[PDB]
Enzyme design. Structure first.
Site, short mmCIF file in Angstrom:
data_model
loop_
_atom_site.label_atom_id
_atom_site.label_comp_id
_atom_site.label_asym_id
_atom_site.label_seq_id
_atom_site.Cartn_x
_atom_site.Cartn_y
_atom_site.Cartn_z
N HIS A 185 34.30 50.10 41.60
CA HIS A 185 34.11 51.21 40.77
C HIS A 185 32.38 51.01 40.25
O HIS A 185 31.86 51.99 39.62
CB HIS A 185 34.56 51.14 39.67
CG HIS A 185 34.80 50.01 38.56
ND1 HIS A 185 33.85 49.58 37.72
CD2 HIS A 185 35.51 48.91 38.53
CE1 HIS A 185 34.03 48.62 37.12
NE2 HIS A 185 35.32 48.03 37.64
N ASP A 230 39.90 47.78 44.11
CA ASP A 230 38.80 47.81 43.33
C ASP A 230 37.76 46.86 43.64
O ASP A 230 37.67 45.76 42.61
CB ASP A 230 38.91 47.81 41.82
CG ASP A 230 37.72 48.62 41.01
OD1 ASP A 230 36.92 48.70 41.49
OD2 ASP A 230 37.96 48.42 39.80
N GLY A 244 29.91 46.74 31.10
CA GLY A 244 28.98 46.05 31.63
C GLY A 244 29.49 44.66 32.07
O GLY A 244 28.64 43.79 32.86
N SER A 272 32.13 44.60 33.79
CA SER A 272 33.24 44.90 35.09
C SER A 272 32.38 44.34 36.34
O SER A 272 31.15 44.29 36.45
CB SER A 272 33.75 46.35 35.01
OG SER A 272 32.72 47.12 35.19
N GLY A 273 33.40 44.07 37.33
CA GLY A 273 32.64 43.61 38.40
C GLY A 273 32.50 41.97 38.45
O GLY A 273 32.49 41.57 39.57
#
Ligand SMILES: [Ca+2]
Length: 247
Positions: free
Chosen positions: A41, A90, A192, A194-195
């Site tokens: 994402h 994802d 911020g 995420s990932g």
């Protein structure tokens, strides 16, 4: 990260900052000299590859550091099953433009086997430079935040996300996801983060159990963080990297 604490420099040396047009937008995790894992994402199709950077070796994002290193990307590879917000798949493999050199502050995290199980309740840590509360950015100089979170099965997590849910939202923890956190509010990954990594302890080492996936919530009750399981993509990662960049 809301409800966490500052890490110390070098504590989470796989944690990377991914920026788009110079603004931090996501975390990621270094997994070799030239590859990083983050969430699909974080890489919408309309974005331009040449506008991303990855900053490695950072502790305080806004501080000068001779140990931090910034790279552009030569490839962004979202898993092909990632279809839209909330989808399975994802995850994204990012190939840096050039390999980096590991250091005291820049080290890869080990990836789990496809069939590695991380038990319910294991205390893992999520890290990032995302918001410290809803709509509140981490204040400069932005020391990396960390939050210890127990793993929560996707089945328990799906029932928590049903509580006071918005009828029009799916809020679905997919088969390739796991959760971690608390049913109480106040302790969560936020915009911020995420990932970025969910790092779990195993036999004295640390593995990348999860990659922070979907969510708006930042500390709401009944909304523990949702993560893509790196184990669900161990085979795909090994296949892709071995074909594209054999050791
Ligand atoms: Ca969250």
């Amino acid at each position: 990260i809301t409800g966490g604490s500052s890490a110390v420099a070098g504590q989470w040396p796989w944690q990377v900052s991914i920026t788009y047009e110079g603004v931090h937008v996501c975390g990621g995790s270094l997994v070799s000299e030239q590859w990083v894992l983050s969430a699909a994402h974080c890489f919408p199709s309309e974005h331009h590859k040449e506008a991303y950077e990855v900053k490695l070796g950072a502790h305080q994002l806004d501080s000068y550091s001779e140990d931090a290193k910034v790279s552009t990307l030569k490839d962004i590879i979202p898993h092909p099953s990632y279809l839209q917000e909330g989808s399975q798949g994802d995850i994204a493999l990012l190939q840096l433009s050039r390999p980096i050199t590991f250091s005291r502050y820049i080290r890869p995290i080990s990836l789990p086997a496809a069939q590695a199980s991380f038990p319910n309740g294991l205390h893992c840590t999520v890290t990032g430079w995302g918001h410290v509360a809803p709509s509140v950015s981490l204040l400069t100089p932005k020391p990396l935040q960390q939050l210890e979170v127990p793993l929560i099965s996707r089945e328990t997590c799906n029932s928590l996300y049903n509580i006071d849910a918005k009828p029009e939202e799916p809020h679905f923890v997919q088969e390739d996801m796991v959760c971690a956190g608390y049913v109480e509010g106040g302790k969560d990954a936020c915009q911020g983060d995420s990932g970025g990594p969910l790092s779990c302890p195993v036999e004295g080492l640390w593995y990348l159990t999860g990659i922070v996936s979907w969510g708006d919530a930042c500390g709401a009750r009944n909304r523990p963080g949702v993560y893509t399981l790196a184990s669900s993509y161990a085979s795909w990662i090994q296949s892709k990297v071995t074909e594209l960049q054999p050791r």
